[PDB]
Amino acid sequence: MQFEKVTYIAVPQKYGQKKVGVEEGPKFLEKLGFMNVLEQVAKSVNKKTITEPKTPQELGVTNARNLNEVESVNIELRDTIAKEYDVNNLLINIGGDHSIGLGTIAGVVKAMKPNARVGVVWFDAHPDMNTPENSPSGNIHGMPLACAVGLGPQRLTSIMPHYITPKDIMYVGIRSIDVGEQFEIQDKHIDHFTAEDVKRVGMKEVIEAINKKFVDYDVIHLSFDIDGIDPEFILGTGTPVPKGISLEDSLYFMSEMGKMKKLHSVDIVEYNPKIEEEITGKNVLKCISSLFGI
Amino acid sequence: QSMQFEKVTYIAVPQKYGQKKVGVEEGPKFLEKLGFMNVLEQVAKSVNKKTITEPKTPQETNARNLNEVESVNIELRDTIAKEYDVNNLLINIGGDHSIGLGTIAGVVKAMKPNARVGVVWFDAHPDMNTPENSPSGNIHGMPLACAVGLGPQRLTSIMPHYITPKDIMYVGIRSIDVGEQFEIQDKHIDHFTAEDVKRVGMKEVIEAINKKFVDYDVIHLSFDIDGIDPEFILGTGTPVPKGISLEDSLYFMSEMGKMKKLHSVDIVEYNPKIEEEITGKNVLKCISSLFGI
Numbered sequence A: 001m002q003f004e005k006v007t008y009i010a011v012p013q014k015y016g017q018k019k020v021g022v023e024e025g026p027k028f029l030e031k032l033g034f035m036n037v038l039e040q041v042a043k044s045v046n047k048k049t050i051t052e053p054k055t056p057q058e059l060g061v062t063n064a065r066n067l068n069e070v071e072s073v074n075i076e077l078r079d080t081i082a083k084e085y086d087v088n089n090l091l092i093n094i095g096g097d098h099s100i101g102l103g104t105i106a107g108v109v110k111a112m113k114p115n116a117r118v119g120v121v122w123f124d125a126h127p128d129m130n131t132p133e134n135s136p137s138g139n140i141h142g143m144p145l146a147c148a149v150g151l152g153p154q155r156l157t158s159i160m161p162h163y164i165t166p167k168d169i170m171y172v173g174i175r176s177i178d179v180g181e182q183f184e185i186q187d188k189h190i191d192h193f194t195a196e197d198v199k200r201v202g203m204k205e206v207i208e209a210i211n212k213k214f215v216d217y218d219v220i221h222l223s224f225d226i227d228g229i230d231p232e233f234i235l236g237t238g239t240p241v242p243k244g245i246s247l248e249d250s251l252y253f254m255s256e257m258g259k260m261k262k263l264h265s266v267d268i269v270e271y272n273p274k275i276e277e278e279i280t281g282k283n284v285l286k287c288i289s290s291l292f293g294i
Numbered sequence B: 001q002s003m004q005f006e007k008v009t010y011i012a013v014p015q016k017y018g019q020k021k022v023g024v025e026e027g028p029k030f031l032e033k034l035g036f037m038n039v040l041e042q043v044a045k046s047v048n049k050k051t052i053t054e055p056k057t058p059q060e061t062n063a064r065n066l067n068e069v070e071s072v073n074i075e076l077r078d079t080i081a082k083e084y085d086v087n088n089l090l091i092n093i094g095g096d097h098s099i100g101l102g103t104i105a106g107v108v109k110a111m112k113p114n115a116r117v118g119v120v121w122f123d124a125h126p127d128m129n130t131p132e133n134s135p136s137g138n139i140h141g142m143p144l145a146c147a148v149g150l151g152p153q154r155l156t157s158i159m160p161h162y163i164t165p166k167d168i169m170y171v172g173i174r175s176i177d178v179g180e181q182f183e184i185q186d187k188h189i190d191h192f193t194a195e196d197v198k199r200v201g202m203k204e205v206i207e208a209i210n211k212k213f214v215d216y217d218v219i220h221l222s223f224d225i226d227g228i229d230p231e232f233i234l235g236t237g238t239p240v241p242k243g244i245s246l247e248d249s250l251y252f253m254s255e256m257g258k259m260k261k262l263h264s265v266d267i268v269e270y271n272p273k274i275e276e277e278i279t280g281k282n283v284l285k286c287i288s289s290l291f292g293i
């Protein structure tokens, strides 16, 4: 409903993938009235901008591309979130590519006591459980949730104060799954509704599954990749994938996520307005509004 | 930049009730669409935005919508008193110029009572009318009169203590009512009209500001966009010709921004429902110049 404040962290990060422009997602959501949405929810908005790295993209064969830039940003992001996270208020991270999700889950973990049970809802076309060794792309944005559970290189996994586990993850709308990511989902029994599962069961039952799963957890964190949503509605994204979640289901999802007492932090990620601006931009904002119940 | 700060306090003030025309309450919202936040992002990594509550009563004598201008200026004063900071920058975005009472009130309330607060008031209008001598009854023509203690009790009492006429530097004034002219001659209020600015050059306005506030603790800048010529600024309720050129307004903001005493700025009277893109962009160029971009 209403909050004393909303912490808004702009995270201009493109270095988790190859395509330019996703660093300008915060800027472009601001042009389309993001601040005015937050103005319906809190009279106070503490915006933090995470420093944009300005080194050239390395674009050749590499198993983890621009590690320095993804490291530096996730460290700064974790630290900012640790200071600003608040179970009485809402923190919203706007990306930036999904390599920030390491930084964001790291931050939430760092804010809590070590005995705190942190749940993660990961709404996405991709599980992002690749490692540098099994990654087809070397794009670190495919690796973050692997890094959070301790699978990955030392410089990323060490950003976690301690690791979360596979049993703390609820995947929603996953479809594009690599071989190494499929291994983790079957081997670790990671709860998930694929896009196809969502269609069959109905997004109502995804919510009951989220609510029943995190009953004994302290906090929930939502990492919302816009490309979990069908490309009919979301074009401004670097890796679109068909048969996604409908916009209708994404708004119902955000509506019911927003009503969870445990939910105090949200990432909105992978908006590249240089790919597509107005249609995508507006639909992202409808999802964000639904989260706040506007 | 230009200048870096630890933070910038951004107070959105959606106030239309100081005048008649709808849409000036949406100035903050519309500056945000045109990239205001991204401008502040060049200056501080932190932005604490505060939204002053928009009154939602119908628009209604000698002082129009007193309740709404009172309630907003009280909330604005109080917010500023908590957030004002001589090491950082506070920027108020209006809203009509009836908020300038609230903003000067806030700066005064933030300082110790013995503090000398200077005011640079860049505007086509002196805004020194009282309810009795006002042609319009629009409270946005009255705030600076209220600040010096001329006006009704419910507005003048918002000041912890009053500023005086000798604390005001007017820049670009041209449209002057009879009662406002009385105050300028009678109280010897320092001023450069738009015509004076042209003749002397905006460099000498700055030297006059710098030499005048040498003994003061802080300066506050209240910047009405209609002080700027209507060639460049159309989205404003009361435009007035022969104003300050955009070139001079950017040089003005550049040199204002470099004043050690300047820690607070109002940007006021943007009505994007009158005109949006041209005006909106030029307002932002002025704001960027203030930060030295």
Ligand SMILES: NCCC[C@H](N)C(=O)O
Pocket: A098, A126, A128, A130, A135, A136, A137, A138, A139, A141, A142, A143, A178, A239
């Ligand atoms: N978030 C996109 C992931 C795409 C692919 N699994 C990769 O690792 O490149």
Ligand SMILES: NCCC[C@H](N)C(=O)O
Pocket: B097, B125, B127, B129, B134, B135, B136, B137, B138, B140, B141, B142, B177, B238
């Ligand atoms: N801010 C515009 C002022 C207009 C006129 N002096 C009045 O008091 O109505």
Ligand SMILES: [Mn+2]
Pocket: A098, A124, A126, A128, A141, A225
């Ligand atoms: Mn992702």
Ligand SMILES: [Mn+2]
Pocket: A124, A125, A126, A225, A227, A228, A239, A270
């Ligand atoms: Mn994805």
Ligand SMILES: [Mn+2]
Pocket: B097, B123, B125, B127, B140, B224
């Ligand atoms: Mn004015």
Ligand SMILES: [Mn+2]
Pocket: B097, B123, B124, B125, B224, B226, B227, B238, B269
């Ligand atoms: Mn004016």
